[PDB]
Design a protein around this ligand. Structure first.
Ligand code: NI
Length: 164
């Protein structure tokens, strides 16, 4: 199951703050800990170079509020990004599969392995912490569409944002 970006993807309009609201994955590990996950925040912006997109993600992982900063590279395909550190053995591609910029975005991430085929992870983001069931429904057909089982899709509890 091969993956297409949102048409006419407009990168400057994806910048700013988002809330992770729903998640699914083919990963077994994620399925066990997909419950214990709550609403996280993602900030996106222009990178150090023109060829990067900077990003910061803030989460509850057990006790601590984690603030994770990373940087993806743009590719030749608008709305498709790459994070690659070969030495660490890490290769992930993520795709903005659908977004209307000012309300929601749906990301699909492929994380690659030497030992099995990629983990496919789907994340739904809102510009607001609040869901809207009808979006959740579409998010499900998107995730199932790329092979994420009915189970393995979870909605996240909103427990607010956290300074670390
Ligand atoms: Ni290995």
């Amino acid at each position: 199951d091969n993956i297409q970006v949102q048409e006419n993807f407009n990168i400057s309009r994806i910048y700013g703050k988002w809330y992770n609201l729903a998640i699914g994955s083919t990963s077994p590990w994620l399925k066990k800990i997909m419950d214990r996950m709550t609403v996280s925040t993602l900030v996106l912006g222009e990178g150090a170079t023109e060829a990067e997109i900077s990003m910061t993600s803030t989460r509850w992982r057990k006790g601590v509020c984690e603030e994770t900063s990373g940087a993806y590279e743009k590719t030749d395909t608008d709305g498709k990004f790459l994070y690659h550190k070969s030495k660490w053995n890490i290769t992930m591609e993520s795709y903005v599969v659908h977004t209307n910029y000012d309300e929601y975005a749906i990301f699909l991430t492929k994380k690659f392995s030497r030992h099995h085929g990629p983990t496919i992870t789907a994340k739904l983001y809102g510009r607001a912490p609040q869901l809207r069931e009808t979006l959740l429904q579409d998010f499900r057909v998107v995730a199932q569409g790329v092979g994420i089982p009915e189970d393995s899709i979870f909605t996240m509890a909103d427990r607010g944002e956290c300074v670390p």
